[PDB]
């Protein structure tokens, strides 16, 4: 129910495949606290945090879903934590794949109907619709996404 345990739980199925070595989750947490990215969507969704580690072997996105908001650390320097229903985590190796994936994510998050569906839809369906969006773009080739990386979170 906190961002530290959610990040560890979320990273676990991705570390299991060797996508990233050296545990990674502790670095993801330290990275998010030192410099948050923009979080509040025009609607009810929340933007995807990223780590840009240098021990990442390939690119991948973990998604999952929360039932209750966990008041994930805010971004704008104001006393405004941003309630998050869906916590995401992406991996990357260099600046260029982070910029490309974040721009794609930007395009995905402004689709409000998709995010509400993410809030109520099943896990097989979450996998299917995000996979479809990743493979639709001419960009994002090579980013790994599989059913094992989408799980319910506490």
């Amino acid at each position, epitope marked *: 129910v906190t961002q530290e345990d959610i990040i560890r739980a979320l990273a676990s*199925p991705l570390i299991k495949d060797g996508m990233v070595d050296e545990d990674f989750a502790e670095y993801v947490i330290a990275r998010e606290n030192r410099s948050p990215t923009g979080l509040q969507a025009k609607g009810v969704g929340v933007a995807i945090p990223h780590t840009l580690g240098d021990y990442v072997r390939d690119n991948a996105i973990s998604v999952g879903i929360l039932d209750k908001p966990v008041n994930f650390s805010g971004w704008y320097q104001s006393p405004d934590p941003v309630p998050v229903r869906v916590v995401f985590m992406l991996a990357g190796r260099t600046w260029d794949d982070i910029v490309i994936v974040l721009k794609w994510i930007k395009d995905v998050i402004l689709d409000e109907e998709f995010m509400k569906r993410l809030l109520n839809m099943s896990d*097989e369906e979450i996998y*299917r619709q995000i*996979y*479809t969006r990743i*493979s639709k773009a001419p960009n994002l080739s090579g980013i790994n996404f*599989s*059913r*094992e990386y989408v799980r319910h979170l506490n």
Partner: antibody
Amino acid sequence: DVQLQESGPGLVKPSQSLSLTCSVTGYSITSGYYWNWIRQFPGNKLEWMGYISYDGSNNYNPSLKNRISITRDTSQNQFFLKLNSVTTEDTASYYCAREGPYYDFWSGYYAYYMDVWGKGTTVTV
Amino acid sequence: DIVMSQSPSSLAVSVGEKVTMSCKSSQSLLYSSNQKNYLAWYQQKPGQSPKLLIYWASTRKSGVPDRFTGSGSGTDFTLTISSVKAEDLAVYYCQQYFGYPLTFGAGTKLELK
């Protein structure tokens, strides 16, 4: 219970696109479940051609992203598969299938089972 | 893509009550949220479209004596034809539902003169 039927100008020249239409019965396209194509070659080789979702999503599995295009007509209860610049490697029989989650001891095991299928063929050239 | 294969390519015998079909996968195909490996055999008669008999022992509508035995990535996923099936000329396919793309392995059993 439910049967599908392939129809269309299977004898298609490489200068034009393949156009194959599948009529389906027993249900409404927009309520649920997914429709897809299974392509079968002269041997035991089968290929997955992707999905057309009840919600309109089109997931083009093949790497030939600008070759395959799938559309829908919900008033005719039909799906339309097109392949641009069809070549000799695409001569195969073609089956439409309707599949999605079916009840198991769990409310959603998403075990498609190929419960619903069609039957038909096309020839290139 | 996840590659599926029929290790013996079947055709083990023309006649034999206790012989099996055997699939292997390059991936574990196991969902940790369910502890179930999603795969199917799709038995097909010549000249007909394929139909599924066994999905991890599920949907056995046209049930006959049979089995589903494997669990891992490669391992040995099998079905047992049993003494009589009344579908003795058939082709079987190897299928998985873990990654997005699907491919099929295959092999047959045929008694022809």
